[PDB]
């Protein structure tokens, strides 16, 4: 492999340059949304984000080493977690609101438009507030996102993936040591960040069941790709 031979700074640089772009929602001016209106904007946005995520995943150090089947399994199991942590990250500087796109900024009142969407909306807002309180850095964010990619599906098949997960762990500590944090502050912040991944997994599972209900409710026609990523969780 070539990911284990990278230094901590070379790991950060590779993850930062592999970052997918921030896509825009469709530019309809009707900011009062309905159930089918908002779900149409979100599925369209998420479908386009999935294409960039799949190419971002290729540029994750150590991901190309896995076989095509393992790459599929990790993406299928983690894709909504990765979308949600990206949404939470870019919603930090907008307290009380979720920035799905620069032109699609929603508050919890607009979360009532979709049935059952307020519960996970509040969880997403709380995660963003948690990131803001911790003063989460983008160098830390890309490490957490790569960890979700490699970890969320690793116990549903692994030796090489755990080697990369340890390397990302070494990278996170390197970032906290570079910021002047003490040893006790280093292992505490590492634990605080990794515990949030448990909550992100929780929001994903709740979100997956929600999208599954949107399918057989047939409020908005889902794309074939989104339907295949959704099928892998049933």
């Amino acid at each position: 492999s070539l990911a284990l031979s990278l230094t901590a700074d070379q790991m950060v640089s590779a993850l930062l340059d592999a970052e997918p772009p921030i896509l825009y929602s469709e530019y309809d001016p009707t900011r009062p949304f309905s159930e089918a209106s908002m779900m149409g904007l979100l599925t369209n946005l998420a479908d386009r984000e999935l294409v960039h995520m799949i190419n971002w995943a290729k540029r994750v150090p150590g991901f190309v080493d896995l076989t095509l089947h393992d790459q599929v399994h990790l993406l299928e199991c983690a894709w909504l977690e990765i979308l949600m942590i990206g949404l939470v990250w870019r919603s930090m500087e907008h307290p009380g609101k979720l920035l799905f796109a620069p032109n699609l900024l929603l508050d919890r009142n607009q979360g009532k438009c979709v049935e059952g969407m307020v519960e996970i909306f509040d969880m997403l807002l709380a995660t963003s507030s948690r990131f803001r309180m911790m003063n989460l850095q983008g160098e830390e964010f890309v490490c957490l996102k790569s960890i979700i990619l490699l970890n969320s599906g690793v116990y549903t098949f692994k030796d090489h993936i755990h080697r990369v997960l340890d390397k990302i762990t070494d990278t996170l500590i390197h970032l906290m040591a570079k910021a002047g944090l003490t040893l006790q502050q280093q292992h505490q912040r590492l634990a605080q960040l990794l515990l949030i991944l448990s909550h992100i997994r929780h929001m994903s599972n709740k979100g997956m069941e929600h999208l599954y209900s949107m399918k057989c409710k047939n409020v908005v026609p889902l794309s074939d790709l989104l339907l295949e990523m959704l099928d892998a969780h049933r």
Partner: peptide, 9 residues
């Protein structure tokens, strides 16, 4: 599957 296409192209 569609995921296999994007992972190869």
């Amino acid at each position: 599957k569609i995921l296999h296409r994007l992972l190869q192209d």
